[PDB]
Amino acid sequence: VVRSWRHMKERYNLIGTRCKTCGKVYFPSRTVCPDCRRKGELEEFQLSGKGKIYTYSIVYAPPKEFNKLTPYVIAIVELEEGPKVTAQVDCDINKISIGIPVEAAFRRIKEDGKDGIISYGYKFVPITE
Amino acid sequence: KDIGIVGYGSYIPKYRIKVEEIAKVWGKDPEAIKKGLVVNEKSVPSPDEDTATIAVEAARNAVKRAGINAEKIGAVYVGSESHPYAVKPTSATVAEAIGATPDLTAADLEFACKAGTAGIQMCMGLVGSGLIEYGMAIGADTAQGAPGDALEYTASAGGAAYIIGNKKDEMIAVFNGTYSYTTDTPDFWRREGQSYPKHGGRFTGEPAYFKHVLNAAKGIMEKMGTTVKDYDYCVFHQPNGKFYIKAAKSLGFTNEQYKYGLLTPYLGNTYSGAVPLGLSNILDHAEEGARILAVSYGSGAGSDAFDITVTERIKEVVDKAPKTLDLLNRKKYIDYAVYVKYRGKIK
Amino acid sequence: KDIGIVGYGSYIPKYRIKVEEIAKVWGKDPEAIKKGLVVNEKSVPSPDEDTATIAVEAARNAVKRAGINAEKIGAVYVGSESHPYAVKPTSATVAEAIGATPDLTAADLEFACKAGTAGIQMCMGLVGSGLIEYGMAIGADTAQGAPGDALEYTASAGGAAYIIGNKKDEMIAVFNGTYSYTTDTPDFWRREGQSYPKHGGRFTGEPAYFKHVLNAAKGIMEKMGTTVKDYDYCVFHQPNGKFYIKAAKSLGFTNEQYKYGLLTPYLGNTYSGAVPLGLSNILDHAEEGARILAVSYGSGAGSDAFDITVTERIKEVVDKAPKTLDLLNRKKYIDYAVYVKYRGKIK
Amino acid sequence: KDIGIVGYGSYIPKYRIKVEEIAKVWGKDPEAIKKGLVVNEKSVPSPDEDTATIAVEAARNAVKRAGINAEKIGAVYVGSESHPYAVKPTSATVAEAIGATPDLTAADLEFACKAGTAGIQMCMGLVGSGLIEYGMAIGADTAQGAPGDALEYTASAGGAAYIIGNKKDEMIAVFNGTYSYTTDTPDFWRREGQSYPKHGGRFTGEPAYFKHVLNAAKGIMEKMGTTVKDYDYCVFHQPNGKFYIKAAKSLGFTNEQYKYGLLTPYLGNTYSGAVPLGLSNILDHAEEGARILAVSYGSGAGSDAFDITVTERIKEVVDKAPKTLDLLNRKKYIDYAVYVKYRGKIK
Amino acid sequence: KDIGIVGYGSYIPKYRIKVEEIAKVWGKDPEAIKKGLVVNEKSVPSPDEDTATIAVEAARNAVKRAGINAEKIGAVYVGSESHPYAVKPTSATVAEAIGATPDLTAADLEFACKAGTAGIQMCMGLVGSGLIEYGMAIGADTAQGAPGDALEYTASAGGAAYIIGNKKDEMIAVFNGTYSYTTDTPDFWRREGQSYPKHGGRFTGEPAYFKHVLNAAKGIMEKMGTTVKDYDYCVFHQPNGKFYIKAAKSLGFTNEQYKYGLLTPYLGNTYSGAVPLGLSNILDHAEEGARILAVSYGSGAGSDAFDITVTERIKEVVDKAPKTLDLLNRKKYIDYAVYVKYRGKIKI
Amino acid sequence: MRDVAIIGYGQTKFGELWEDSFRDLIVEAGVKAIKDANVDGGDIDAMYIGNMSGGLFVGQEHIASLIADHAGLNPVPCTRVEAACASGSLALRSAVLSVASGHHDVVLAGGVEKMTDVEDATAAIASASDQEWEAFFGATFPSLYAMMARRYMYQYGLTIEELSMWSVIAHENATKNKYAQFGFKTTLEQVMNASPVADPLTLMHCSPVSDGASALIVCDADKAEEFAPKDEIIYIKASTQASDTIALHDREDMTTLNAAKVASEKAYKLAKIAPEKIDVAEVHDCFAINGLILVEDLGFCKKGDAGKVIDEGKIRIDYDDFVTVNPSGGLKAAGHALGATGIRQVGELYWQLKQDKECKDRQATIKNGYGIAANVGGTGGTVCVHLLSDKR
Numbered sequence A: 001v002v003r004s005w006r007h008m009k010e011r012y013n014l015i016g017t018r019c020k021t022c023g024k025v026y027f028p029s030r031t032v033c034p035d036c037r038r039k040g041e042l043e044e045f046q047l048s049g050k051g052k053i054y055t056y057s058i059v060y061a062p063p064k065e066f067n068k069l070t071p072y073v074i075a076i077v078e079l080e081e082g083p084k085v086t087a088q089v090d091c092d093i094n095k096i097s098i099g100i101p102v103e104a105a106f107r108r109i110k111e112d113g114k115d116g117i118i119s120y121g122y123k124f125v126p127i128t129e
Numbered sequence B, C, D: 001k002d003i004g005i006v007g008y009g010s011y012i013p014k015y016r017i018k019v020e021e022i023a024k025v026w027g028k029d030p031e032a033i034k035k036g037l038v039v040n041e042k043s044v045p046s047p048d049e050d051t052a053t054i055a056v057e058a059a060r061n062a063v064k065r066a067g068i069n070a071e072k073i074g075a076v077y078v079g080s081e082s083h084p085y086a087v088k089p090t091s092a093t094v095a096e097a098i099g100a101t102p103d104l105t106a107a108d109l110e111f112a113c114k115a116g117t118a119g120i121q122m123c124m125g126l127v128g129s130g131l132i133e134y135g136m137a138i139g140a141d142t143a144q145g146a147p148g149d150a151l152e153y154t155a156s157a158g159g160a161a162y163i164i165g166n167k168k169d170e171m172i173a174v175f176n177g178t179y180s181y182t183t184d185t186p187d188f189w190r191r192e193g194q195s196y197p198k199h200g201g202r203f204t205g206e207p208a209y210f211k212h213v214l215n216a217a218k219g220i221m222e223k224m225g226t227t228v229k230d231y232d233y234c235v236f237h238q239p240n241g242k243f244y245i246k247a248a249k250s251l252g253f254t255n256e257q258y259k260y261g262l263l264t265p266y267l268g269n270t271y272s273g274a275v276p277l278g279l280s281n282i283l284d285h286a287e288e289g290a291r292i293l294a295v296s297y298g299s300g301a302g303s304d305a306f307d308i309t310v311t312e313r314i315k316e317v318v319d320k321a322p323k324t325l326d327l328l329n330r331k332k333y334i335d336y337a338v339y340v341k342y343r344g345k346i347k
Numbered sequence E: 001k002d003i004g005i006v007g008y009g010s011y012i013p014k015y016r017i018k019v020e021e022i023a024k025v026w027g028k029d030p031e032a033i034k035k036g037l038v039v040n041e042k043s044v045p046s047p048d049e050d051t052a053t054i055a056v057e058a059a060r061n062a063v064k065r066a067g068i069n070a071e072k073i074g075a076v077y078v079g080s081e082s083h084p085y086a087v088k089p090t091s092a093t094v095a096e097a098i099g100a101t102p103d104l105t106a107a108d109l110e111f112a113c114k115a116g117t118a119g120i121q122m123c124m125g126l127v128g129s130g131l132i133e134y135g136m137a138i139g140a141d142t143a144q145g146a147p148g149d150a151l152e153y154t155a156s157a158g159g160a161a162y163i164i165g166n167k168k169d170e171m172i173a174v175f176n177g178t179y180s181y182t183t184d185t186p187d188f189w190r191r192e193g194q195s196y197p198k199h200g201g202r203f204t205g206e207p208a209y210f211k212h213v214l215n216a217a218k219g220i221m222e223k224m225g226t227t228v229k230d231y232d233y234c235v236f237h238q239p240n241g242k243f244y245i246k247a248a249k250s251l252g253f254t255n256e257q258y259k260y261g262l263l264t265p266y267l268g269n270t271y272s273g274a275v276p277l278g279l280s281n282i283l284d285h286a287e288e289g290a291r292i293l294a295v296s297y298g299s300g301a302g303s304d305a306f307d308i309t310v311t312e313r314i315k316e317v318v319d320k321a322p323k324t325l326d327l328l329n330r331k332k333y334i335d336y337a338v339y340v341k342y343r344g345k346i347k348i
Numbered sequence F: 001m002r003d004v005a006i007i008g009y010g011q012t013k014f015g016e017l018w019e020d021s022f023r024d025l026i027v028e029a030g031v032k033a034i035k036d037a038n039v040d041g042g043d044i045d046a047m048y049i050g051n052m053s054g055g056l057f058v059g060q061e062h063i064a065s066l067i068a069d070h071a072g073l074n075p076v077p078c079t080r081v082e083a084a085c086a087s088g089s090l091a092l093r094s095a096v097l098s099v100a101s102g103h104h105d106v107v108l109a110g111g112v113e114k115m116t117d118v119e120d121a122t123a124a125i126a127s128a129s130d131q132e133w134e135a136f137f138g139a140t141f142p143s144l145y146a147m148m149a150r151r152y153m154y155q156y157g158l159t160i161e162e163l164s165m166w167s168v169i170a171h172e173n174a175t176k177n178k179y180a181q182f183g184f185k186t187t188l189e190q191v192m193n194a195s196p197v198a199d200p201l202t203l204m205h206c207s208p209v210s211d212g213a214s215a216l217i218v219c220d221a222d223k224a225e226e227f228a229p230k231d232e233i234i235y236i237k238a239s240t241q242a243s244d245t246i247a248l249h250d251r252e253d254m255t256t257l258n259a260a261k262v263a264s265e266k267a268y269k270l271a272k273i274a275p276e277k278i279d280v281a282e283v284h285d286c287f288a289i290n291g292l293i294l295v296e297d298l299g300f301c302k303k304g305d306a307g308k309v310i311d312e313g314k315i316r317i318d319y320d321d322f323v324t325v326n327p328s329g330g331l332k333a334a335g336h337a338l339g340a341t342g343i344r345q346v347g348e349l350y351w352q353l354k355q356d357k358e359c360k361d362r363q364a365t366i367k368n369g370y371g372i373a374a375n376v377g378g379t380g381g382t383v384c385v386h387l388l389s390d391k392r
């Protein structure tokens, strides 16, 4: 609920930060730059959802809530700006491999039971090309 | 100048239940609740009443004040959190019940307690664009609070209806402008399955209700180039009297400016009827040339702001239908047992 | 002065289920169903997709075609029969996901399968009145057919979004006029409690669907002074292919006029997304100066009719996002077991 | 081998609700109800009390009267219509709660209001066969009546436990014989899904309750070669006072014979606990050599008859635990609001 | 004084569903599930069948083997986890369907999968005390596993009835003794409201199933002064094939001793019918003088142990009704769609 | 800066412990450690316990007070240290730093875990990962380590057969351990054809969820001679700790644990030793790949050629000319009680370097008298390294 509310623009729109001192792009957005610390000047930066599979795994026995999705692809995607993210990939388990170009998609990531909040966010999909 | 209210109407069911009657059952101190929430009692619909009937009563009263043939109404919108059907529309029943059918458009609106005013804006657009001559917007609800919960002290039944027109000779009030502030916020919600809602507790206040109400109030006053001193009366969303007053005081409104708008202490929270009912009571008392600020609020996070000016034609119409305050004082008290019976809170 | 569509977009999930797969389970003749309903297969949403995600995909594709900054979108309306929350609004999530927040109005519209087109009219009014520069109207749904019922063969998932602007240089299509026919009709409904709807059977057809669709089509053509000969293409509500064609043929439309609008045979009934999706496919194929007749229908007793003309700017934008037909043909078939798993039809 | 009761015990919760309090809410004449059913008030369980707890309280009281170590109990049977779990057994909790575990057998019994007495027969067999030395049979229920219904006036909480033994000196009462009349009757039932039952109305009366009770009475008196003059006291099933007396009077029992057995007027119908509780009150008052007749009833269509003779040892045991009548008069009245709160009759 | 089984009967519905068909839907490896639980398939009741019909079929078969007039049956007990009604008793409909009515007592039994054997003990007592001449005890169930869950591979329908008597010349088997071990254990349960049960996972095995089954087996053999060598055949509770074998092997039983009682790889877990059905298959094959150990288990935390001896009358009655193994092999396979349809697992 | 040594070590059995209550586990470890230590309960100046679960299963925080209360050692101070799977070593390191300060002379460092009580341990174990940015999206703990394994294979050509060889050694070694959760041997085919949890990992590449407890008794090197004989005293040369990014997707290189490189290097520097001198090592092999990677990061071989090192069998107890790794079953076969594992690793080095009767059957050959332990929290966000020696 409250935690969902804070990182919505990140999960929904992939909005990270850019350090002008470095030039480096960070996602998720950081409050303190790991290199420059207080010196780093931060501006909000909108990432494109485009990225490539850096590594991946297929989850065969997940929590009871992911029963419909089983087996699913979890992966670490290297985005074209540089940041890496962990997310699921909507594709057949035989079609996934390292280096596959993917694109972020707005999906229903979770729900807090029958009565709680629904949590949306990014899930990657392979590009048509 | 182009767009304005030509008629307004309201309805409140007769049954009430005092805070004391609810607290008694749940082992709470009534005076603590009353002081805390700024609420004394609330409206209870009869078992043969619902959001549709309430909407119809209010719609019919608005037509009386407008003094126009309902065949001229080109759109009916009903904003509620408690539409009787999940699929069949309330607005279609209200249209049939006022004989506006069949040459019109309609839709049922959902946006927590902001749904009623959402439709006012829709009617403003359609009349202003010339797509229709008159539009009706209704905000009505038969709210249900969870038996053990605090929302049980406020959740109540009521509705008010507004007819929007283009004719200076028929306008009793004029829209100077509208503004809306909307975000995605999980402060309060109800999932399709559940009969009673779930809330985030203290997260509902500052980060949601105040954030959206005050931003919308500041946005409209920025849009109009206006200050708190320019407005004669104000009405805000009133989940309880506490929130309403804090917001009014925060913006710099005095009791004389906000008193007419605040009905919750003796009516409760009618959700989508709340601000519409408040505004209707302001219009029952208002004089020519009075400027009103009206700001609504909806969970999931939205607020609609209005800047309205009252016209010469106001006193002509007030007595054409029942005054909000008269409906509010024609009442019959019930105990909790009868209340749970009426509400179908019985298993 | 002139109102028109500046951008449109659509989304269809990848999964399908053939009639044959459903019939097999329930002991029915697939060829009989296919012939009767004029339907071959339908769209099935992924378990991680819902009306909100579908609306967001559409909305985002409409923004690409519009080529405008979403900060300029003044209201977002989402018309659905399957909003994820009973109280928290979808339209806010959509607004947040396209970055139109916070300076906007929004509302979630309910009117069976006509809620989508209801919001187009709302955006038409607000833009035309000058209250907003751009408004977005979405029609999306992840429909539910009862397991044993015939609605299981058609009820499907899909969405389309439309952005409305005033500026001629940005418009790809122009509204010549709109008309609506609305009554109170108990042909089909769903009570707040129930997960699956109830219908009146044969009373749904002639007295309800045809009555409202044909009256609205006749009404628009009277308003605009047209004839079936004046229109280049047409799109009607398509609960099944049978009803759609009957209506088209009844008004005197040839196959060449109605073929693009009819998607149900391979898509199913996407309820609030049906005519929006059909209209989007017409726009994907349409040439400059084409006149479209679009008539929607909603179970409660509603129909919205549109008279649209296609502009020069059409070929510029079509390829800026996925064509409706491309989404429709990018598909993956599933059996009935998988389908009931995905849709949560399992207890 | 001769079989008999070595110990008995009972429990009734403290809360009551008068007929007047229920009638008041539902708009009925209390005097009409009271006269009709022969009922003045009924016991209510605390929100922290359930069938198990009642069974444990009564089991524990029976052990006090028996004066034996619970480790010697070789079977515990709990008959109820309201077992807290649909699968996990109550009898296992009761066995643990008195320390008879682990060397024993147990089972939860379902047969409407006859279950309790069905286990008495089971214990009779197991000690009589020599398979165990002591067996416990409990009848207890937390009764729920539909809010609007007449069963709301009678459905109540309570229970009673009986320890059956083989030894002569330890018996406080002796079984002369048992008889049962069972057929398939749809007078009253509840389906697995439903929380409240459905009934036959008038069909439960004469055809079902009287037929089985009376046939089981002639069955035991034919089996024992006895008449109604031979019995000192009697206890029948008591859905209401009206039925109980009409059965007693029909067989030729005088008020002096049936008065101790009838508790419903101030206790209500404790379903499985009804006859056991009645029999326990008879045993609280009975003198040595008293021959009693006990006939139970269960809605599905069965009845259990008992022919019992009281022994010298009663004068010792009665005061070792609370008398049924003392528990019945240890009471605290509540209104209907608190009652629906306690019972979880709230949504 | 001497108590024994005069007649026994069993019923299994025709429909089956292979593990492969369920796994396919839920994205699991069938060979993994198949290997683990040693389950290949399970029985599925027709949509016009339930625990009452299954109990009636088995009851009727037991009367055929007994060869006695049902008017003589003085008690009918039905042990189930899936009685059609929450209030109206199954045992009453079964009594009516055998024509034992009206001179009898009856009751519906609940104790997870032990319910069936609980009633056998009840009948033993009433016949032994002389209160009745014949009693019938039935263990039947139309179990339903949660769609996503592993219990979906085993949950099955089946039933078995036993008629208990005291006449020496009518007995086909004789009770040497019974023993029960019962505690309060929250390993598995279902609360009145819920349609599907909740389980504790691995806490169901060692601390619950093994604890009660082995203690009850040890307890009866201490009561009878016997050893694992004295018994010719054995039947334990069969939630999974694995649990059954581990228990048998733990006590020192060889495959030849436990092979006849284990039906779960091709029948599934019939809950209250499990051991009764297993015991019935042992009796279908057993020779005169065969010593049987039968131990049941119920989730609430209970076990019933039996020490049985076969009689020469066995050869005569076996063919009077359908053999358990014949019912088990008369079968029709279905896919998962038809299965959820039949079971009413789909929302309607 | 006083020198610290270990006088004793006590360990409960590991795994599905249904009978043993939580209080029985901590007592059982504590009393066994006290006997080996030959100290009285009154001699303990302070207790340091680390628990990752923190009654996530139980619902109980303030576990330290509870433990001291039930131990009957009030009013001695008891403190709880937390760092996921590394909570044990961190409790030890905190215990070392108090002795070193001189504020306490005899301190107990313990670890205890109860995961059998909850039906789904998966949710609690995942707590070590970033909930907002990994767990939220469905990244299970085995899937994170499977993603490490995948990238390692992609970069260094490790095969599934090589990786599976790590498990057969572990299970072979565990048969010589009475406290081990699994006392059976396995083949390569059995490891590879086991039920898959997360591709490429199978069930036989993962450590199990398990209950248990272990406690060490730390004392000042000078005072240690009072309670124990010199030959049964083992000295803690250095206790190092380092940190890394909590999320795997934030690491500069996934195939390596920098926090292990940082901590191990600092530990070698203070001991003035090279990795070639280490006789026995206990590494965090919760997912086998974690076993390979730590062997490289502790400097026993170069990056990439871990697969060759095991497929040959260099790390086996029978092998002579190389370091012996996880002679006890390890997390894979001995078991993995999150809070107690960090302690257990060190207690094994204690036994191995003092040639104790407990590890007689799995006794490694001790040439230089040195042993290292590497405990890891989560995917590597925290690593704590302890280096032990028979000589002060």
Ligand SMILES: [K+]
Residues within 6 Å of the ligand: B086, B110, C086, C110
């Ligand atoms: K709704």
Ligand SMILES: [K+]
Residues within 6 Å of the ligand: D086, D110, E083, E085, E086, E110
């Ligand atoms: K039941």
Ligand code: NA
Residues within 6 Å of the ligand: B086, B087, B088, B089, B090, B108, C110, C111, C112, C300
């Ligand atoms: Na509607």
Ligand SMILES: [Zn+2]
Residues within 6 Å of the ligand: A019, A021, A022, A033, A034, A035, A036, A037, A040
């Ligand atoms: Zn920087």
